[PDB]
């Protein structure tokens, strides 16, 4: 009746951009990025990978409401270090780890029976 | 009505295991637990899904329309 379409969980609406980067007014050298059509699956991973970078002061994600598939990610890095680069490094690290994991799982799969 | 195709909880297919279950009950003369075990229903959600089901379509087919 008033239930929203399912594909609105992963399909970007009319005019809706994927990432919304906004300058944080609270703490200096901080940023809040709005992820659209994404849930905890991406947010938790990215946030957990941003805490590995020792040049990142703050990193936290949140889903403001379960009705809508979107989450905000706040990042604060040290001076002389753009947070977008921290996000990029985190993402690339994730991709590399997943690639290695895939390769290892494949090699380990080839050595099995039944 | 009829045997549910898949388990509500996890999602394992169970609709292909109803007649096999019935046979395991009447042919091999097993109890419900073992019959459910042999069909690969280890999790009690699917085990429930088959054990708890009442096949009402057999009574429905008794009508001519």
């Amino acid at each position: 009746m008033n239930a929203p379409d399912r594909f609105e969980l992963f399909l970007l609406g009319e005019g809706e951009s994927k990432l919304k980067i906004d300058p944080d007014t609270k703490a200096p050298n901080a940023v809040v990025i709005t992820f659209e059509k994404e849930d905890h699956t991406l947010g938790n991973l990215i946030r957990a990978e941003l805490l590995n970078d020792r040049k990142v002061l703050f990193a936290a994600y949140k889903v403001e409401h379960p009705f809508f598939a979107r989450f905000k990610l706040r990042i604060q890095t040290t001076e002389g270090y753009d947070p977008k680069d921290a996000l990029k490094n985190a993402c690339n690290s994730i991709i590399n780890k997943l690639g290695a994991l895939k390769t290892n799982f494949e090699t380990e799969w080839n050595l099995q029976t039944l | 009505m009829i045997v549910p195709v898949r388990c509500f909880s996890c999602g394992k297919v169970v609709g292909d295991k109803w007649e096999s279950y019935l046979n395991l009950l009447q042919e091999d003369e097993l109890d419900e637990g073992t019959a459910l075990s042999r069909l690969g229903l280890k999790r009690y959600c699917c085990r429930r899904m088959i054990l708890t089901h009442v096949d009402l379509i057999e009574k429905f087919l008794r009508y001519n329309p």
Binding site: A27, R54, K55, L57 | -
Partner: protein, 130 residues
């Protein structure tokens, strides 16, 4: 800088319906008119009965808390168990007996002494070693 420094002797450990924090009761081994009560995270720094813990009250080592990076940074401690809290009460038992009350995120502390430079300030680092 430093505000207080002494060595205390643990006289009692009390897990009052807890399993991560125990109330410790100790006394100074220098001043016979100085005693200490302190809630301790046993899960981190285990404190059995009859121990000689070195206790220090610092004022430094406001701004946001940066992670210990790298470091490559002056920790100004190298202790075993360090906390940070806020004084909230200056009880005066006698003219020769002055007590202070610290609050470390709920972990309270009652330090009774005599001679102090402990003002009602947010700056209250509690460093314990050995």
């Amino acid at each position: 800088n430093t505000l207080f420094d002494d060595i205390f002797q643990v006289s009692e450990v009390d897990p009052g319906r807890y399993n991560k924090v125990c109330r410790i009761e100790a006394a100074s081994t220098t001043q016979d008119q100085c005693k200490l009560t302190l809630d301790i995270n046993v899960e981190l720094f285990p404190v059995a009965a009859q121990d000689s813990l070195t206790v220090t009250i610092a004022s430094s080592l406001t701004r946001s808390w940066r992670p210990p990076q790298a470091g490559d940074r002056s920790l100004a401690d190298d202790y075993d168990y360090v906390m940070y809290g806020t004084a909230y009460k200056f009880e005066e038992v006698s003219k020769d007996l002055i007590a202070v009350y610290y609050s470390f995120g709920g972990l309270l502390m009652r330090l009774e002494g005599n001679y102090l430079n402990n003002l009602k300030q947010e700056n209250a680092y509690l460093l314990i070693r050995r």
